[PDB]
């Protein structure tokens, strides 16, 4: 599948992201073996995005939509729902499944 969502700690079970809302998160991005390539946590600054604008990889678009506010989850994202056969220069190899540890902090 494009994304698999595995819950680390539950959310509110009620408030799920909608178009027009700003999702505020912390994340750590890694390969399937846990090797870290990026983290907002390390910058002590949350990351913000919105649905429906093609501004995040599709695995986030579909994974975070399945999370409720407060939830922490592991999103395992297939290459086609991330950087595909190309990868990301300097950061992620070709054909890489990505794992993001994401905390959905709030909707604004």
Ligand X SMILES: CO[C@H]1C[C@@H](C)C/C(C)=C/[C@@H](CC(C)=O)C(=O)C[C@H](O)[C@@H](C)[C@@H](/C(C)=C/[C@@H]2CC[C@@H](O)[C@H](OC)C2)OC(=O)[C@@H]2CCCCN2C(=O)C(=O)[C@]2(O)O[C@H]1[C@@H](OC)C[C@H]2C
Name the site residues for ligand X (rule: CB under 6 A).
27, 29, 37-38, 47, 55-57, 60, 83, 88, 91-92
Q: Of 81, 83, 92, 101, which residue is the catalytic one?
A: 83
Q: Can you tell me the distance from the alpha carbon of 51 to that of 19, in angstroms, rounded to the nearest whole number?
A: 5
- Smaller CB separation from ligand X, 18 or 36: 36
Is 37 one of the annotated active-site residues of the chain?
Answer: yes
| 3-class secondary-structure state, position 23 | strand
Residues 6+ apart with CB under 8 A from 14: 68, 69
Is 100 one of the annotated active-site residues of the chain?
Answer: yes
- Which residues carry out catalysis? 27, 37-38, 57, 83, 100
């Amino acid at each position: 599948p494009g994304v698999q969502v595995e819950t680390i700690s539950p959310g509110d079970g009620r408030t799920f992201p909608k178009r027009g809302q700003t999702c505020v998160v912390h994340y750590t991005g890694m390969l399937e073996d846990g090797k870290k390539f990026d983290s907002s946590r390390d910058r002590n600054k949350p990351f913000k995005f919105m649905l429906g604008k093609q501004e995040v990889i599709r695995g986030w678009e579909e994974g975070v939509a399945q999370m409720s506010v407060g939830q922490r989850a592991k999103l395992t994202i297939s290459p086609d729902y991330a950087y595909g056969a190309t990868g990301h220069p300097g950061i992620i190899p070709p054909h890489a499944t990505l794992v993001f540890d994401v905390e959905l902090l709030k909707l604004e």
